[PDB]
Design a protein around this motif. Sequence first.
Motif: not given
Lengths: 513, 513, 509
Positions: C17-38
């Motif tokens: 459940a966690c990495k599902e919710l997460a691993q947006t942040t992994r590319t979505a966190y930090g000095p930028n984030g990589m947008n994810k289409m919903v």
Amino acid sequence: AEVARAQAALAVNISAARGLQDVLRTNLGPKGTMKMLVSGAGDIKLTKDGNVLLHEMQIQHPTASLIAKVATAQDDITGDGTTSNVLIIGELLKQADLYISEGLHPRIITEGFEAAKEKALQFLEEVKVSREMDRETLIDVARTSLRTKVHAELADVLTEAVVDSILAIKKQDEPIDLFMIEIMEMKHKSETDTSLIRGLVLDHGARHPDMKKRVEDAYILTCNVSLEYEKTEVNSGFFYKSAEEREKLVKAERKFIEDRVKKIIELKRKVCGDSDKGFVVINQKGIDPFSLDALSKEGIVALRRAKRRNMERLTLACGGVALNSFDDLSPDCLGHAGLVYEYTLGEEKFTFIEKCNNPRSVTLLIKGPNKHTLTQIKDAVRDGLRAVKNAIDDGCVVPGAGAVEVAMAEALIKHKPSVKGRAQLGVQAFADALLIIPKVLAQNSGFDLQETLVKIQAEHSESGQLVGVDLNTGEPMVAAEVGVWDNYCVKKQLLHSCTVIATNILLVDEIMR
Amino acid sequence: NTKRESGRKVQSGNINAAKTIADIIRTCLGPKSMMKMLLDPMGGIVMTNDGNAILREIQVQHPAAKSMIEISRTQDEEVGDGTTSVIILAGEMLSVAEHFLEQQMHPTVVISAYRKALDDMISTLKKISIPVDISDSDMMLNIINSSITTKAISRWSSLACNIALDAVKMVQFEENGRKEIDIKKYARVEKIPGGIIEDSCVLRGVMINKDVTHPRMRRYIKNPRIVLLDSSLEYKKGESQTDIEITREEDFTRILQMEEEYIQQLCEDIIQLKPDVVITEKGISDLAQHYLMRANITAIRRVRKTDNNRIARACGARIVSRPEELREDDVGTGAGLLEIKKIGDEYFTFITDCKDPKACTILLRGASKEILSEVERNLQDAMQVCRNVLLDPQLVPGGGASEMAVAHALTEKSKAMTGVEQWPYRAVAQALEVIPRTLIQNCGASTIRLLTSLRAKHTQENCETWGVNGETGTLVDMKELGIWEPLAVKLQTYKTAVETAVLLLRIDDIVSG
Amino acid sequence: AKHFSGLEEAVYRNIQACKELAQTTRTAYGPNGMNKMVINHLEKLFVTNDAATILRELEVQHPAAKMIVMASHMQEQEVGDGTNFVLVFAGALLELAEELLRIGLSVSEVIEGYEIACRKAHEILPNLVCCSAKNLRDIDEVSSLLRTSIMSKQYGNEVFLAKLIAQACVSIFPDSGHFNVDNIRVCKILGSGISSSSVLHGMVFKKETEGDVTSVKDAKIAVYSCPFDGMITETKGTVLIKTAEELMNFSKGEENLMDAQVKAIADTGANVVVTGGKVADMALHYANKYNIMLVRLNSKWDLRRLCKTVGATALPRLTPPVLEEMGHCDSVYLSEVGDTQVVVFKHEKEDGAISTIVLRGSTDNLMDDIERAVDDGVNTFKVLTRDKRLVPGGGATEIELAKQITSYGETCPGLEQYAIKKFAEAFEAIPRALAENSGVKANEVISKLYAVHQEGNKNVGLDIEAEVPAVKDMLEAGILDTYLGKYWAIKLATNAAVTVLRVDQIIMA
């Protein structure tokens, strides 16, 4: 149709139970956990307490019906042991299983049990020592009864508030707390917590600067049915006899609102003399802005939305009489709360009815933003409330952490039921279900339910020592010193609800669908 | 249509349904019992020592599963007990008899062995039955308290019997004490919901729960005037039919109130005179009865004329068409106690009618309305053995040793009878002895060596009198042990038992139409 | 199913459940984030950076994760950067138990491990606060934190949305020593640039401004969800084209049927009308006659935003509105909010608490991605006002804590020895997230972030510098989170973890 008979029907029974039971064994002591519960609603519930898990959902078997029965016993009759009560029976069942695994009559092994329970009951009287109902003496019972039920740290802060609640008594002595339970769940920065707030607390109170937030001298007209009708204990139409009559009442409905505040503004000065004593109308529906203001402007506190319970606890707390109308009432019946205090915490007002003239009703303020946290903390409270209320009702107290069970299983030393040995086996069978608390913990906690308990056994066989598996690390100690002390209400009843249902399945040789 | 049904198949299914129904019930029998737990198709579990309670609530089938409940109910009503015996007896005889004998291939000699076994059973019973005092409730107690402990309940052994003991003696019949025939409208029991066994006592007479249902009715007026209809309140309650209009919608409301307005005058002529009691067998309407309750005239209704006639004379009365019309004068009071107890708001009028046929509705209470029933269910069997000690002072001791007492007496007649019939008459004999064996195999060990010792004991020591202990299995004296199998109850179970198996013999064939 | 058995809920469900919710942040966190289409039940492409934003639309069956999404929403309201961090943090925290599950350590045991250590960690978090800064006014200085908090939550202009929300959050207030929930609302408007976005304090109705302009200084509104086709207490008028002659009577009647309306509007008083419903042909022309401003055909958005900021409440009917139903704004005026000419109010002390950052772009998702940012610029600035404490940008504080909580494991010994070692491990997936968006191993990051072995600044973020993982100082980079942010983001990720970590099989009939 078809049936089941002999040990075939028996096997289905004894297997389904001990198949369901060990699922519940995941949780007991603090080293248990909180079992995820999702019923048909979809809500997750985490409980180490039996009644929740037992009475919500079950893997459906003919045994699953009786388990909640004696589960409807423990929580009812006591409230501590619901977690503990389940783990006893199947441990006894596997024992008796051995004897009918040998082969024997479930009837003769039935007769081998209840005496041992009756023995242990005797032995429970024997080994225990009557203890003080003193607050801090209760703590060692309070934490444990809570902690055997729910995890320690929650039970630890509960240890304080639950005792503070069960010591709040006027000396109304009960196994449980009916009135001492007033639970206010509040969305708060604390996800799991319970605030003890004395006195009856009202579901809400109304804001207005002229409306007194602080009423120390309260003349309480309990108020339910709104301003909008004249002398009405229920809101209903004085009109609407035809289609166009629908417009006439609402044109005259604002009149009664001013009529009603007119009653309350005079009923204050009637009863309260001057406006210094806050006249309290707790209006259990919404107060209309004009009379919301005009009662404020007159000094009457018009309180928005108490509860039917806050109406009945008011009848208790304030020592005065409630009403469903705002009508002018004789000054006698009007309730007096030595404190009527609207309390805005977060955005919500919780009006204290305090200096309860019957302070058997106190209030607990539950904390969480997340209901799954807010439900669970609410859950740990009350099963432990009545648990710790079984501490302060009981002048007798039974030391916990397996101190008393080794005082049975060993002091049950056999050939005392020598006759057929079936009791000598049945008491042996019963002796082996005693230690599930020393078992499940050293199981849950470190080491072994066995290799630690052998010390417990041994160290009890040593010097008659009160000894037990830790609730925490699962190693030997002296359970009397630790203070872990079970409610005297638990032990006796904890035994009864077991062997009575443990008796039934044995005499049940038959099942049909 | 072309159809025929062949031989053994039904007979098997008979024997099949015969013994299977006998299995758990006979293990539920005895001092050492079992339990028959049904599991409903819905998931509800039903655990009862009475399979008649289990089978009727579950699938009932075309074979003897249809014919077992009929003869159980035949055994239910008459004496009141033996309910579990017939199906374990009929399932007992048919199996052991038929197959071996149908392997000897014959229905007819099998039929005769029943009536053969019937008399020896009558013989050694009536012989070794032991007369016990009809007028000694203690000598009644040990025989009557034995039949209470028989099924699920020793709880009411003392209490139900005590309440049953004297009442039945204090009952009479139309043909006369109670004794003689079985009439259970002279055995009557009406519940007092809730209450307590202390509020309960022996009511040797009848109660009418509907005599005084309200404090307004006649209470504790001990010369009653009971009145049967005919003038004051006439047979006809019909409408006054005043100013009726078929063209008016308002008259529809009028005609229903008009029924009771004539009844109003009916209970009003009761007021005009006030015979202190009024009975109506078609019942009195309320609006008129309010006026009865104004006049302190107890309103008796929904209990029969024959009931009231038996109650009236037994409470005393002078019946009239109307008190201004005296048909003839009868005695004013026939009872020594007129008592109205109030548990709940309901008033229960207990009129003790001493040495009266009456209805003998006896005051009984448990702690609550539910265990209140187990007074009656035992009272019935208690009053059964009360009427039985009156009916048959002579009644056997046994733990089922009677079931041996016949079988060996059969065998020793069977040895004397010889013929081919020897074998059926013996194949009927060895059936009887599994019933007590199941009681004492529930005890344990070798129940055969017990039966050895039994049939050793049989002619050696005694047959049924010096018996076998249902809780032990050793050779004892059931009189000395105080356990009693009532002669009537014994024989009666068998009369009912022998026939169904003969039917199952008669039926190799059924139809669908 | 949401009902389960077989230990999945314990040793499987949570880490799934966690990495599902997460691993947006992994590319979505930090000095930028990589947008994810919903995509929603409405079909359209919604790019996401903030954790609670992609999870808001994500509808989970997980009995596990339903605890944690709230914690992000908790974290969101609180600070707003670190909600990403929260998902990926608990990503490291929980899974390490699987080893201790293979190693055989019980449930509460290792939980007590992370707990007393997250107690130990929360103790160190004020110690690891690195400098501080704030101004209740200054855009630029405040922008940098509001820049760097939305960094994780924005790949777009970091400085531009830094300066706007800093302006917005500040300059909607006389102090900004106080900061509240909505101090800023948005009129999402296209055209020109996305960096044409402007901070206009007041209530913007991007809706039509109609009726003859009557007041400018008087922005007081009688707010109505009531359409004006003639809807008023005595006669509720609608527009009915059913017959021609009845339409002739409407124009006649409506002028008067609209008369008693904008009358009763300005009776109880206002010169500006918020009509959440329609206004008819002759209804508006009478407002042109009546001399009142009808801001018509508004949204529920422009209805509520006003109803939120002015405290007033829309009327579905027309009764004379109370002051509870009538708000006042500084001035009603026609001005361009990021170059868009409609009615834009002014809000400071009349009713107030609405800045309007006009969200802009060539589409709504550009206005949704800058929505991602300034929401945290709202949230973090409150924290900034609550605490001006600055703490190393996400991942630069971790390497500190890991070292500390490492030997703290050997102060622990006993089964929490390793669980605290694992809690020392629970920190470090965050720069891993940062480096994994950068695509590079944190294994090089880790050793270099341990190279000097203090960790007060050094981190590898989202850069083309990280393309070869390279220590940068988030502290010195202007990437400095807020203590509460650093406190909250650890707290709930540890809180929601331990409570879902004791879960057992679901019982169901």
